[PDB]
Design an enzyme around this catalytic site. Sequence first.
Site, PDB file in Angstrom:
ATOM      1  N   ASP A 159       0.800  -1.307  -0.103  1.00 48.77           N
ATOM      2  CA  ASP A 159      -0.027  -0.168  -0.043  1.00 48.77           C
ATOM      3  C   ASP A 159       1.008   1.368  -0.069  1.00 48.77           C
ATOM      4  O   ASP A 159       0.432   2.312  -0.538  1.00 48.77           O
ATOM      5  CB  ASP A 159      -0.761  -0.020   1.261  1.00 48.77           C
ATOM      6  CG  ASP A 159      -1.991  -1.270   1.435  1.00 48.77           C
ATOM      7  OD1 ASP A 159      -1.715  -2.050   0.407  1.00 48.77           O
ATOM      8  OD2 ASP A 159      -2.577  -1.110   2.427  1.00 48.77           O
ATOM      9  N   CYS A 200      -2.819   2.193 -12.525  1.00 50.56           N
ATOM     10  CA  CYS A 200      -2.849   2.049 -11.331  1.00 50.56           C
ATOM     11  C   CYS A 200      -3.822   2.960 -10.744  1.00 50.56           C
ATOM     12  O   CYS A 200      -4.945   2.414 -11.035  1.00 50.56           O
ATOM     13  CB  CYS A 200      -1.327   2.287 -10.659  1.00 50.56           C
ATOM     14  SG  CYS A 200      -0.378   4.094 -11.038  1.00 50.56           S
ATOM     15  N   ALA A 237      -3.740   6.759 -10.143  1.00 49.21           N
ATOM     16  CA  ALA A 237      -3.560   8.210 -11.037  1.00 49.21           C
ATOM     17  C   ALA A 237      -2.894   7.898 -12.289  1.00 49.21           C
ATOM     18  O   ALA A 237      -2.853   8.708 -13.072  1.00 49.21           O
ATOM     19  CB  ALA A 237      -2.778   9.441 -10.053  1.00 49.21           C
ATOM     20  N   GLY A 291       2.763   6.784 -10.733  1.00 48.20           N
ATOM     21  CA  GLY A 291       3.683   6.409  -9.906  1.00 48.20           C
ATOM     22  C   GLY A 291       4.083   4.921 -10.044  1.00 48.20           C
ATOM     23  O   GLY A 291       5.338   4.831 -10.706  1.00 48.20           O
ATOM     24  N   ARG A 292       3.375   3.872  -9.996  1.00 47.39           N
ATOM     25  CA  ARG A 292       3.572   2.384 -10.046  1.00 47.39           C
ATOM     26  C   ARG A 292       3.735   2.178 -11.628  1.00 47.39           C
ATOM     27  O   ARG A 292       4.408   1.489 -11.771  1.00 47.39           O
ATOM     28  CB  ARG A 292       2.547   1.568  -9.335  1.00 47.39           C
ATOM     29  CG  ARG A 292       2.746   1.525  -7.923  1.00 47.39           C
ATOM     30  CD  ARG A 292       1.605   0.673  -7.526  1.00 47.39           C
ATOM     31  NE  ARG A 292       0.967   1.064  -6.047  1.00 47.39           N
ATOM     32  CZ  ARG A 292       0.133   0.433  -5.303  1.00 47.39           C
ATOM     33  NH1 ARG A 292      -0.467  -0.677  -6.048  1.00 47.39           N
ATOM     34  NH2 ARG A 292      -0.503   0.932  -4.186  1.00 47.39           N
TER      35      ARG A 292
END
Length: 487
Positions: free
Chosen positions: A387, A421, A423, A426-427
């Site tokens: 998380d 992911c 938004a 990031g990932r």
Amino acid sequence: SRRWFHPNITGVEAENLLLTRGVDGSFLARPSKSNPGDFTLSVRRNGAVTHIKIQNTGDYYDLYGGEKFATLAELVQYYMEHHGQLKGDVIELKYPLNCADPTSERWFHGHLSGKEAEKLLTEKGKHGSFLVRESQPGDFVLSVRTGDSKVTHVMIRCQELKYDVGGGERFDSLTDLVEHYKKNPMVETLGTVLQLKQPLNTTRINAAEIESRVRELSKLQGFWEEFETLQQQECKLLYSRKEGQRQENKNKNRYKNILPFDHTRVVLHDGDPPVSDYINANIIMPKSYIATQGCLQNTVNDFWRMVFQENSRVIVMTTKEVERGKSKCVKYWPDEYALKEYGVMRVRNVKESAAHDYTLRELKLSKVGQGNTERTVWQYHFRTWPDHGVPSDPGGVLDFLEEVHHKQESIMDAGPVVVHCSAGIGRTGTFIVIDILIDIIREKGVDCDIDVPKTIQMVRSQRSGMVQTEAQYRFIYMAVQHYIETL
Ligand SMILES: Cn1c(N2CCC(C)(N)CC2)nc2[nH]nc(-c3cccc(Cl)c3Cl)c2c1=O
């Protein structure tokens, strides 16, 4: 200009800076000392300094009593062009308070001897390649390469907090000096023009020697400095995001201020016979990708319209539907063996196969009233990403990527790989960059050049804030290292 970001200051230093050198409306941002990975936005208002927390677990910059942003510069640009938005009392970001510290510049090399810097400009440099080092007694040295060949050393004296090259103007920072001699180059007596074309590339490494670089970047950390030098280059990526801001498109964004760039956005041509061409998605060109946000209940139809139009046969989901009790992406696929219609598109879930780190779903997609449009779409759902932060070992991500790659290579004329992911920055950015980097090491092998920040910057011009944290940045290096070591 991202000068309002001070990388080596404490909250107290920041308070004195804004009170003695600022005015009401003066502001600065800095990395948190009490909790690394966090940021502080310090604003002067009615003679007093307000410290605002900014948080980044890896998905976006979350400002306390504010909005979610793709980058710090997009945050600062928003509040400087949307007053009354930052709070009971209104906080105005009027005057950025500039930082004179050269630590986050691509050209600043701190401690580096004259022979070592000459070895760097001789082996790695080209015409216009420069760097700035610490002398060799509180002074500095500007070392430049010219030709198609030689190396010139310009002494920089620090006198009473001012910088100069011997004569002429005295600059308040090394940066103001470098920017001046970048525009108006120093001409030597016999005609040599000391052109400061590009900073010396020291981040480009040979793949076989990744373990050597990772070892050095881990020493007192080197990873923090390389990443912060990359963040400082984000002010060159404020491309327009007009389409995403249109009133008819607002509720198609998961986070109102995380928008696709207009120049690389995915334009939908299905067109229900008013504003049917929009999705919060961008084309990522290094095999292509599409970087997108997790579906909203109202964007599931648009998602399948995108997948279909782009001829994508592979989807990478890097999030669970629900994380920390918060909806991250809606379920856009049917239950196993079930068939569902998402507007003009039809999806059947043929088979679900669970592995330790992920689920694979075999989906069949077609347009309603046209059977010959049918194609298999493979949905790779990664389920074990934490998380907060990153996995502690890159094995699982690497096995998953290796499997996504083989599926994509086995399908002839497959369109870009869809990656999402929450938004979608990031990932998503982390998965695409590892995948880009490992693709270079596939075709060219161990004897090839890899440049992590150059790759990230290139992906960031196509979608805002791709690769969000320093931890993801270090994870990219760790994954590339593990791939080269397991070959
Ligand atoms: C030279 N260099 C350093 N250095 C130099 C000086 C140092 C010892 N102080 C720390 C590490 N860091 C960096 N991070 N990103 C970059 C970078 C690379 C390619 C394209 C783009 Cl656009 C960026 Cl931004 C970069 C860089 O060029």
